[PDB]
Amino acid sequence: MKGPFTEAEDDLIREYVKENGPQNWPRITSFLPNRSPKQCRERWFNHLDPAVVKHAWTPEEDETIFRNYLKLGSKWSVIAKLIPGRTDNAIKNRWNSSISKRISTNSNHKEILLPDRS
DNA sequence: AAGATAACGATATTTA
DNA sequence: TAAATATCGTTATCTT
Numbered sequence A: 001m002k003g004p005f006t007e008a009e010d011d012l013i014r015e016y017v018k019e020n021g022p023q024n025w026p027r028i029t030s031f032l033p034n035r036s037p038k039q040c041r042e043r044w045f046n047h048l049d050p051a052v053v054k055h056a057w058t059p060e061e062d063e064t065i066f067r068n069y070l071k072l073g074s075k076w077s078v079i080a081k082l083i084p085g086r087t088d089n090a091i092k093n094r095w096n097s098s099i100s101k102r103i104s105t106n107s108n109h110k111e112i113l114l115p116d117r118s
Numbered sequence B: 001a002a003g004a005t006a007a008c009g010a011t012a013t014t015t016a
Numbered sequence C: 001t002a003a004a005t006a007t008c009g010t011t012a013t014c015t016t
Helices: A007-020 A037-048 A059-071 A088-102
Strands: none
Touching (some): A007 A037, A059 A088
16 A cells, blocks of 8 residues: 555554554564555654654744754754654755745855745 | 645665 | 665645
8 A cells, every 4th residue: 555544554553563662663564464564664753653743843943953954964864863853754844845945145144044934 | 826744765774 | 694774855645
């Protein structure tokens, strides 16, 4: 199977983990025979886990992601370790869709992040 | 549509 | 070295 997960699916995962843990991902074929370990792991870490955060993007967060992108590259795994609860893919999305297109000039000539308007 | 967010596919990095 | 998992660009899928 491919494409977005069903709440039924999300349940098999939560079971597996609760049961075995979030690691021996290949043998999670024992459940959801139609979904790669690869894709299940991903669903957990990025979308199911207790730690994933759900509130909108605080401009604080935006600042952080920005400030490091300037110094570091697109080293998201690293940045996702600096913003508690936000995964690495989440950040990757924040920058490409929002933060990327609101960078700007300053008058001591150093880029500054505009505040979004959505 | 434009504005986000979720998942794919290829590849690199960690681990036992 | 190999099998397991972690990372990242691109893309498929919402959401507004």
